[PDB]
Amino acid sequence: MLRRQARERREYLYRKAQELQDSVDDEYAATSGIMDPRIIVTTSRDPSTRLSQFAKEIKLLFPNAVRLNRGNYVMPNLVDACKKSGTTDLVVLHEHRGVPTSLTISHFPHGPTAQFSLHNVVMRHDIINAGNQSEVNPHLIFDNFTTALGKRVVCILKHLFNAGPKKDSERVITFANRGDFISVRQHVYVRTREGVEIAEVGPRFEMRLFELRLGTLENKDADVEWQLRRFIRTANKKDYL
Amino acid sequence: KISDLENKVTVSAICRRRLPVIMHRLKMAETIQDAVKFIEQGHVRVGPNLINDPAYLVTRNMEDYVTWVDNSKIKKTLLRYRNQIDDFDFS
């Protein structure tokens, strides 16, 4: 069925080029609110314990996620076995001496793969014993995503959560843009008579997008929709390069 | 496309579902002139069952499985030229 996956991905490239000519986007409009997405979280290869507990924190962060083990899983048959499992997103974590550095999000049914550098992390497994996470299907909040690339990353980044939470649904997850650095925290709260009081729990980090390829994770022949430009002579002069 | 089916679905598209031109776009033959010879000799199945009439419209959900049968001369010489003729399953 390699001719089937090639024909469907060639149809996908045509649909993306046609939508970019006549500019929820094209890749997600079939399943914007119907199917609750499932997320497979993996590490790089022979992970460290600190990276593994960070991946456990990420699996606990956004629901319908399993933390699949990664040792001697070859990447192409990994992603096609994930396709035959028929889940939706893959999330790969690359570390450096226990500090995680790369978070690759791949919406693998012929969809986009974004890649994020992941700068200042804080792990609740090595700070705070306060109990379990809340694990309710959360609310999401986003701060000044106004660029077209910002709308694209907020689409592929909020289309991995549980669709349609309730009013009582407690935990909120923030994605704040502070000059092309998506800062992530997540909180629970109550409503006081004075107002609202938040409680920081779970991870915190900030991620900078650096590649956003139209193909799947394994190919490396994927046409680049966007990647940053580190070495132009106007790099530090604008945002969403 | 909803209302602009007035102009595009013509002879050049309704004949593009034909098994000879789908064969030629799948590069299973040199041209139509011998693709019709193959599928009239009865070497080419689609799905599980063999198809012989060279006016068949392969549908959308059957274009993936229009392949040569087992135990045929052209499948044998294809696997011979590639030198991968796994002769357990008949060819």
Binding site: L2, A6, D221 | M28, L78
Partner: peptide
């Protein structure tokens, strides 16, 4: 050529492939 290799379509046949 890597893209054509990843879409090789393993059932191609011509008259020139006999030797």
């Amino acid at each position: 050529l890597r893209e054509k290799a990843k879409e090789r379509n393993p059932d191609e046949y011509y008259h020139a492939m006999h030797s």
